[PDB]
Tab-separated table of C-alpha atoms in Angstrom:
chain	number	residue	atom	x	y	z
A	1	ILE	CA	-33.456	32.034	99.439
A	2	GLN	CA	-36.514	30.650	97.640
A	3	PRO	CA	-35.555	29.918	93.981
A	4	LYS	CA	-37.642	31.241	91.145
A	5	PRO	CA	-38.189	28.674	88.335
A	6	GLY	CA	-36.288	28.620	85.064
A	7	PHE	CA	-36.392	25.458	82.958
A	8	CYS	CA	-36.675	21.738	83.344
A	9	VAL	CA	-34.573	18.870	82.023
A	10	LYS	CA	-35.895	15.333	81.586
A	11	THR	CA	-33.385	12.515	81.743
A	12	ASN	CA	-33.173	8.930	82.997
A	13	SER	CA	-30.965	6.767	85.131
A	14	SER	CA	-30.962	2.968	84.972
A	15	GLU	CA	-33.671	2.885	87.705
A	16	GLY	CA	-35.995	5.413	85.984
A	17	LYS	CA	-36.991	9.054	85.345
A	18	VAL	CA	-34.996	12.032	86.641
A	19	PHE	CA	-35.990	15.679	86.191
A	20	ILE	CA	-33.679	18.572	87.001
A	21	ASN	CA	-35.290	21.920	87.727
A	22	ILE	CA	-32.905	24.708	86.879
A	23	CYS	CA	-33.980	27.696	88.918
A	24	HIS	CA	-32.347	30.970	89.810
A	25	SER	CA	-32.167	33.238	92.810
A	26	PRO	CA	-30.793	36.741	92.822
A	27	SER	CA	-28.767	35.881	95.885
A	28	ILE	CA	-26.082	33.382	94.887
A	29	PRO	CA	-23.818	35.531	93.343
A	30	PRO	CA	-22.649	34.761	89.730
A	31	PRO	CA	-19.265	33.667	88.483
A	32	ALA	CA	-18.893	37.368	87.584
A	33	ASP	CA	-17.684	38.000	85.074
A	34	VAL	CA	-16.695	36.757	81.609
A	35	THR	CA	-18.059	36.664	78.074
A	36	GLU	CA	-18.398	33.914	75.441
A	37	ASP	CA	-14.789	34.369	74.307
A	38	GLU	CA	-12.916	33.653	77.551
A	39	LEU	CA	-15.064	30.830	78.959
A	40	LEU	CA	-15.558	28.880	75.670
A	41	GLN	CA	-11.754	28.651	75.966
A	42	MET	CA	-11.136	28.309	79.716
A	43	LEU	CA	-13.025	25.037	80.017
A	44	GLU	CA	-10.021	23.522	78.240
A	45	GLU	CA	-7.958	24.698	81.244
A	46	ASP	CA	-8.528	26.943	84.307
A	47	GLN	CA	-10.196	24.271	86.480
A	48	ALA	CA	-9.773	23.589	89.237
A	49	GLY	CA	-11.322	25.972	89.574
A	50	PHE	CA	-14.049	25.895	88.850
A	51	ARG	CA	-16.574	28.695	89.120
A	52	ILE	CA	-20.299	28.530	88.263
A	53	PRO	CA	-21.646	28.461	91.786
A	54	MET	CA	-24.836	26.383	91.907
A	55	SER	CA	-26.910	25.096	94.804
A	56	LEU	CA	-27.941	21.487	94.368
A	57	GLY	CA	-31.114	20.883	96.345
A	58	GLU	CA	-32.054	17.546	97.908
A	59	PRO	CA	-34.096	15.112	95.890
A	60	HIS	CA	-37.852	15.220	96.173
A	61	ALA	CA	-40.275	12.711	94.708
A	62	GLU	CA	-43.075	13.641	92.368
A	63	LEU	CA	-45.552	11.988	90.046
A	64	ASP	CA	-45.115	11.869	86.282
A	65	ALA	CA	-47.883	12.048	83.659
A	66	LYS	CA	-48.731	8.340	83.662
A	67	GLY	CA	-49.015	8.479	87.460
A	68	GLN	CA	-45.749	6.627	88.142
A	69	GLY	CA	-43.252	8.053	90.618
A	70	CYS	CA	-39.978	9.729	89.798
A	71	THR	CA	-37.226	11.911	91.183
A	72	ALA	CA	-36.737	15.667	90.949
A	73	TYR	CA	-33.696	17.855	91.764
A	74	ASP	CA	-33.626	21.645	91.989
A	75	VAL	CA	-30.487	23.457	90.870
A	76	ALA	CA	-30.128	27.220	91.403
A	77	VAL	CA	-27.778	29.730	89.766
A	78	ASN	CA	-27.558	33.553	89.792
A	79	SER	CA	-30.532	35.413	88.198
A	80	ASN	CA	-28.313	37.889	86.367
A	81	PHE	CA	-26.243	34.931	85.156
A	82	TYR	CA	-29.393	32.937	84.262
A	83	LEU	CA	-30.507	35.626	81.831
A	84	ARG	CA	-27.111	35.474	80.083
A	85	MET	CA	-27.583	31.728	79.697
A	86	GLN	CA	-31.122	31.829	78.262
A	87	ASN	CA	-30.166	33.234	74.832
A	88	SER	CA	-27.140	30.927	74.328
A	89	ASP	CA	-27.414	27.200	73.535
A	90	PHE	CA	-23.762	26.505	74.364
A	91	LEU	CA	-23.848	28.034	77.848
A	92	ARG	CA	-27.147	26.277	78.541
A	93	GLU	CA	-25.601	22.933	77.581
A	94	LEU	CA	-22.703	23.725	79.870
A	95	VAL	CA	-24.880	24.513	82.894
A	96	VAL	CA	-26.876	21.347	82.362
A	97	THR	CA	-23.647	19.346	82.220
A	98	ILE	CA	-22.200	20.863	85.401
A	99	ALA	CA	-25.609	20.291	86.983
A	100	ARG	CA	-25.735	16.586	86.155
A	101	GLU	CA	-22.024	16.151	86.990
A	102	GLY	CA	-22.158	17.817	90.428
A	103	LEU	CA	-25.384	15.976	91.276
A	104	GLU	CA	-23.927	12.541	90.405
A	105	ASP	CA	-21.172	13.164	92.931
A	106	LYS	CA	-23.270	14.515	95.786
A	107	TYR	CA	-25.936	11.830	95.625
A	108	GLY	CA	-24.492	9.049	93.596
A	109	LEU	CA	-24.204	7.760	91.129
A	110	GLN	CA	-25.392	7.151	87.569
A	111	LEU	CA	-27.248	9.706	85.477
A	112	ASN	CA	-27.954	9.732	81.742
A	113	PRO	CA	-25.375	12.094	80.158
A	114	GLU	CA	-27.816	12.493	77.210
A	115	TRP	CA	-30.973	14.526	77.809
A	116	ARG	CA	-34.011	16.411	76.667
A	117	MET	CA	-35.205	19.838	77.808
A	118	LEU	CA	-38.992	20.281	78.241
A	119	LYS	CA	-40.688	23.091	76.321
A	120	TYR	CA	-43.893	24.103	78.137
A	121	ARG	CA	-42.964	23.276	81.727
A	122	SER	CA	-40.502	25.169	83.841
A	123	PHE	CA	-40.476	22.935	86.917
A	124	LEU	CA	-41.776	19.576	88.122
A	125	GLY	CA	-41.992	20.071	91.878
A	126	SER	CA	-43.205	22.840	94.172
A	127	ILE	CA	-40.486	24.239	94.462
A	128	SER	CA	-38.254	24.185	97.585
A	129	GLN	CA	-36.724	25.448	99.827
A	130	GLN	CA	-33.866	26.252	100.416
A	131	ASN	CA	-30.680	27.200	102.360
A	132	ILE	CA	-31.203	30.815	103.519
B	1	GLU	CA	-44.171	16.234	68.273
B	2	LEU	CA	-43.563	16.539	72.073
B	3	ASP	CA	-42.414	14.778	75.284
B	4	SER	CA	-44.722	12.679	77.479
B	5	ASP	CA	-44.281	15.202	80.346
B	6	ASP	CA	-45.341	18.648	79.114
B	7	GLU	CA	-48.613	20.595	79.216
B	8	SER	CA	-45.321	12.024	66.099
């Protein structure tokens, strides 16, 4: 399953720049299904839980604008679910948070909780690969 | 304006 690009989130981490590429693949499948009502409320409980399946790709190194090196992670969700997300700030903020949170655990350790989302760039890497 | 990583 080769992920198709979505958006890109710049953040930092004590040792320097970290970019998370949020992609999507039709084959994941979603946490089907729920609307804004239920899940704005079930974060307060439900878990664990918890749904939102996402693949968290290995790190890969890439160059930034100034030519200094930095780290990039690719996170994939369901395409159908991704489209839900894209016209909803809250859900977007959620996915980013789960993405940073689940990454911190898998790879260790610190990540900036606070972030920025790029505007004109959908992905930093290539992008790879993954786990067909 | 913008971030240092796109394409005051």
